[PDB]
């Protein structure tokens, strides 16, 4: 709910004691309590000002170790005070597994834990040390309730793996396979549970981003910009303008439920090869999806503007969108229907009345 | 489930020998997970087996306690395992 | 919907 990771308990102070934090090489959260020092280790960079000593008075101290991925904060609240362990904890990790920790020391008391993947308040046996790691296997069942970020992250790393070396794969994937995967990917992006307003999956040759739309989003247009560093791959940057009508709930729609924006940015056309295998500028294929919605006959069009290096001696640039035939099981094709092109030498803009 | 079959070949009160049919595709490695069926996901355990192997040994279990054992296949080829992991096959073994 | 800019000769 409110944080990615919460580990709480009580500490019996039998003497003047210290707080110690280290950045671990391993992606674990390690908590080790000795009589003189409470030690916390996490994969995040150490904040440079971490206080050395705990409050002088002896007694029982309630504590909670907090991690939040989008706030980038790993802080330890302790008794009446709060200690900031890391200020740059913005890294995709999923804590759902406790490892056996056989360290000796002063056991912690009334310990409990809850994470994003395991949101229940789970009491743990008291122990001098605790180790929190992740499962590698996908333990989330086929509930369709929510998709796990780290599971989706590995799936998108798998696709990126194929885009880098599509010649190396064991098979040339059929159209039905690719269509099934792109449906699955879209489905998982609309249902993935995360804490921030935006979640981006940035991989080699693919970048998928999820926007949690506000109720206010229907009121105003949406502007999106990207950065690609101007290498000589023929495409350098893009911008998007999404009209307010695209985000508007339908006339007979109810409940004002949250909707999501999906921008899947491909730097590869491996999944979009028509018959005759037509080429696309910079292999750029840009997927735009409003969750479970099709809009058509737009007054103000969605516009896609692309900066590129010109190669116009024997070629013209035409804005198109990928269309497939359900019940064909055959490769798709490009269509320019309802999409107007303005193609200056170094810049081209696509004006489409639908997405 | 890419592993077509999953069976227990042998067992002791605390240990287990599982076996599974390999699929007709390249498997890089398998992931075996096991835990007490009613226990919390924090306590679950897992290890890896090379994809050339079709058996595994699970030991250190409590006697007379139901355990859920799950086997995923895995590889790095998107055209074989698009979600990197297969669909799981699971047994519930009492021991 | 996947938008792209076709290269037509
Ligand atoms: C799972 O649930 C348990 C139980 O609710 C959570 O433990 C609770 O953790 C919070 C935050 O650390 C504790 O709040 C503190 O309360 C003290 C005051 O001391 C209390 O006084 C009452 C009587 O008034 C006693 O009954 C309590 O035992 C305790 O001594 C305050 O000074 C602190 O500033 C802080 O607000 C809370 O006391 C504690 N509850 C129990 C029963 O231990 C646990 O965090 C949760 N785990 C999660 C969410 O992961
Ligand atoms: C992947 O795409 C996302 C969304 O297009 C990018 O996030 C945006 O980055 C720009 C900088 O170019 C920021 O101005 C925006 O604010 C970001 N979006 C949001 C919602 O905050 C992200 O940079 C892209 N990553 C890569 C590697 O290309
Ligand atoms: C704390 O430590 C003291 C001795 O160091 C011990 O007697 C006591 O039981 C411990 N626990 C509490 C809650 O005081």
């Amino acid at each position: 709910p409110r944080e990615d990771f919460r580990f709480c308990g009580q500490r019996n102070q039998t003497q003047q004691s210290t707080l110690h934090y280290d950045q671990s090489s391993e992606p674990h959260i390690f908590v080790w309590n000795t009589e003189e020092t409470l030690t916390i280790r996490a994969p995040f960079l150490a904040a440079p000002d971490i206080p050395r000593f705990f409050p002088e008075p002896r007694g029982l101290y309630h504590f909670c170790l907090y991690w939040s991925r989008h706030t980038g904060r790993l802080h330890l609240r302790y008794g009446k005070h709060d200690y900031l362990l890391s200020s740059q904890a913005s890294r995709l990790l999923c804590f759902q597994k406790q490892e056996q920790s056989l360290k000796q020391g002063a056991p912690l008391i009334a310990t409990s834990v809850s994470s994003w993947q395991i949101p229940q308040n789970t009491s743990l046996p008291g122990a001098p040390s605790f180790i929190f790691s992740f499962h590698n296997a996908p333990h989330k069942v086929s509930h369709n309730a929510s998709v796990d970020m780290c599971d989706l992250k590995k799936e998108l790393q798998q696709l990126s793996r194929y885009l880098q070396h599509p010649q190396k794969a064991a098979k040339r994937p059929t159209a039905a396979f690719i269509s099934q995967q792109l449906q699955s990917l879209e489905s998982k992006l609309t249902s993935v549970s995360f804490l921030g307003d935006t979640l981006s999956f940035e991989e080699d040759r693919v970048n998928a981003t999820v926007w949690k739309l506000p109720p206010t989003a229907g009121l105003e247009d949406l502007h999106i910009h990207s950065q690609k560093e101007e290498e000589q791959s023929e495409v350098q940057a893009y911008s998007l303008l999404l009209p307010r009508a695209v985000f508007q709930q339908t006339r007979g729609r109810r409940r004002d439920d949250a909707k999501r924006l999906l921008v899947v940015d491909f730097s590869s056309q491996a999944l979009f090869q028509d018959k005759n295998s037509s080429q696309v500028l910079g292999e750029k294929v840009l997927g735009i999806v409003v969750q479970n919605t099709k809009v058509t006959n737009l007054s103000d069009p969605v516009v896609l503007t692309f900066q590129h290096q010109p190669q116009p001696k024997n070629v013209t640039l035409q804005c198109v969108f990928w269309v497939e035939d359900p019940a064909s099981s055959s490769t798709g094709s490009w269509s320019s229907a309802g999409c107007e092109t303005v193609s200056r030498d170094t810049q081209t803009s696509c004006l489409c009345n639908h997405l | 489930s890419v592993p077509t079959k999953l069976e227990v070949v042998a067992a002791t009160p605390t240990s287990l020998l599982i076996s599974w049919d390999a699929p007709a595709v390249t498997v890089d490695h398998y992931v075996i997970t096991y835990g007490e069926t009613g226990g919390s996901p924090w306590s679950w355990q897992e290890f890896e087996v090379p994809g050339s192997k079709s058996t595994a040994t699970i030991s250190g279990l409590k006697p007379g306690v139901d355990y859920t054992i799950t086997v995923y296949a895995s590889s790095f080829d998107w055209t074989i395992f698009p979600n990197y992991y297969s669909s799981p096959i699971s047994i519930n073994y009492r021991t | 919907t996947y938008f792209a800019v076709l290269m037509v000769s």
Side-chain angles (χ1 to χ4, degrees), chain A residues 1-51 53-79 81-140 142-167 169-218 221-227 230 235-252 258-274 276-312 314-355, chain B, chain C:
Chain A
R2 318 187 55 187
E3 314 92 18
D4 288 78
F5 182 88
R6 200 197 295 253
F7 167 73
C8 298
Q10 303 180 15
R11 178 159 186 274
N12 203 5
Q13 273 221 301
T14 82
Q15 70 187 52
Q16 181 178 357
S17 185
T18 53
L19 171 64
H20 190 80
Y21 174 80
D22 309 291
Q23 180 187 347
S24 57
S25 294
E26 293 179 312
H28 309 336
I29 296 181
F30 177 62
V31 174
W32 184 5
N33 193 43
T34 65
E35 217 200 329
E36 71 281 357
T37 302
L38 173 66
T39 298
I40 296 172
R41 297 203 184 121
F44 315 114
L45 184 76
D49 60 328
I50 298 174
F53 292 85
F54 275 118
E56 152 72 55
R58 262 166 239 106
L60 231 53
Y61 275 131
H62 276 98
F63 72 89
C64 286
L65 177 65
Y66 298 95
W67 177 52
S68 176
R69 183 196 47 80
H70 69 323
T71 322
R73 297 294 186 83
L74 175 81
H75 63 109
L76 169 73
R77 199 174 164 279
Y78 186 92
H81 206 203
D82 172 83
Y83 301 80
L84 293 172
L85 303 185
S86 178
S87 177
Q88 296 280 7
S90 50
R91 171 182 174 176
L92 176 49
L93 293 175
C94 300
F95 294 107
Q96 64 244 2
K97 170 185 188 177
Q98 182 180 16
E99 309 269 15
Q100 181 166 258
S101 189
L102 303 171
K103 291 300 192 303
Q104 313 182 301
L108 296 172
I109 304 157
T111 49
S112 45
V113 71
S114 64
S115 74
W116 189 258
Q117 300 73 21
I118 314 180
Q120 301 77 18
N121 189 345
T122 299
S123 64
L124 306 173
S129 66
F130 296 80
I131 297 182
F132 297 99
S133 314
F134 57 92
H135 298 285
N136 251 344
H139 286 191
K140 312 314 136 198
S142 180
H143 188 325
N144 295 327
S146 63
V147 172
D148 175 86
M149 318 163 55
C150 293
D151 296 332
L152 182 46
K153 172 73 163 175
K154 299 207 229 66
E155 296 186 6
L156 272 161
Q157 291 177 327
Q158 178 62 82
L159 173 58
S160 170
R161 214 168 296 124
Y162 172 73
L163 302 176
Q164 302 177 49
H165 311 95
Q167 54 276 343
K171 303 194 295 185
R172 188 155 181 273
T174 69
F177 180 91
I178 297 170
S179 169
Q180 185 178 281
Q181 289 321 300
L182 297 175
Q183 274 297 113
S184 161
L185 172 70
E186 176 178 325
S187 195
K188 290 164 181 169
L189 290 170
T190 73
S191 57
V192 61
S193 69
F194 59 102
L195 200 44
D197 274 333
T198 302
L199 187 58
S200 297
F201 293 89
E202 289 152 313
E203 299 307 319
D204 197 38
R205 273 157 206 96
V206 75
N207 179 16
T209 305
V210 181
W211 282 267
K212 294 212 210 171
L213 284 176
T216 326
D221 284 27
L222 255 301
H223 290 261
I224 265 75
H225 324 92
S226 75
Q227 200 33 251
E230 195 253 2
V235 64
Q236 296 174 17
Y238 72 75
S239 328
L240 302 187
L241 181 270
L242 299 180
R244 43 179 172 258
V246 172
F247 309 103
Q248 292 181 339
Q249 208 62 17
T250 207
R251 257 188 284 286
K259 298 292 160 154
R260 285 183 176 188
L261 176 60
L262 271 61
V263 172
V264 175
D265 172 17
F266 282 102
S267 299
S268 165
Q269 68 177 76
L271 310 180
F272 302 88
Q273 299 272 52
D274 56 26
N276 316 339
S277 302
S278 308
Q279 296 177 0
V280 179
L281 186 84
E283 299 176 0
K284 268 293 174 179
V285 186
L286 214 62
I288 313 176
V289 163
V290 170
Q291 180 174 353
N292 297 320
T293 301
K294 246 272 182 57
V295 194
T296 198
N297 194 32
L298 289 160
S299 296
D300 297 334
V302 329
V303 320
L304 296 81
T305 50
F306 306 133
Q307 293 80 291
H308 56 84
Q309 71 184 36
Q311 59 284 97
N314 56 320
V315 84
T316 310
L317 300 190
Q318 174 177 27
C319 299
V320 293
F321 65 94
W322 187 258
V323 57
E324 61 186 54
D325 183 274
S328 62
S329 69
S330 172
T331 175
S333 67
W334 298 108
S335 178
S336 61
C339 285
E340 182 194 358
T341 304
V342 296
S343 184
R344 295 166 196 184
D345 206 30
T346 201
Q347 166 166 321
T348 303
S349 319
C350 301
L351 289 80
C352 301
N353 54 16
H354 64 281
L355 62 73
Chain B
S1 320
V2 144
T4 292
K5 199 173 300 182
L6 172 61
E7 67 181 12
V8 163
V9 186
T12 77
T14 68
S15 72
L16 195 55
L17 176 62
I18 59 174
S19 191
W20 60 88
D21 277 342
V25 294
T26 301
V27 177
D28 175 88
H29 70 273
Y30 294 93
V31 176
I32 287 79
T33 70
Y34 65 100
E36 298 179 30
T37 297
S40 84
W42 287 101
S43 66
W44 274 61
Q45 304 198 267
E46 62 196 56
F47 62 99
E48 299 188 340
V49 173
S52 53
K53 193 71 178 307
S54 159
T55 57
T57 306
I58 301 166
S59 49
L61 309 172
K62 308 176 183 176
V65 170
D66 302 314
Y67 285 92
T68 302
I69 296 114
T70 295
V71 181
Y72 308 81
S74 188
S75 115
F76 291 97
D77 194 336
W78 181 78
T79 65
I80 304 299
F81 294 104
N83 309 296
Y84 181 67
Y85 290 110
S86 71
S87 288
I89 190 174
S90 293
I91 56 174
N92 202 13
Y93 187 77
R94 148 62 48 118
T95 228
Chain C
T1 298
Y2 283 89
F3 303 88
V5 280
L6 199 61
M7 303 195 329
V8 293
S9 67

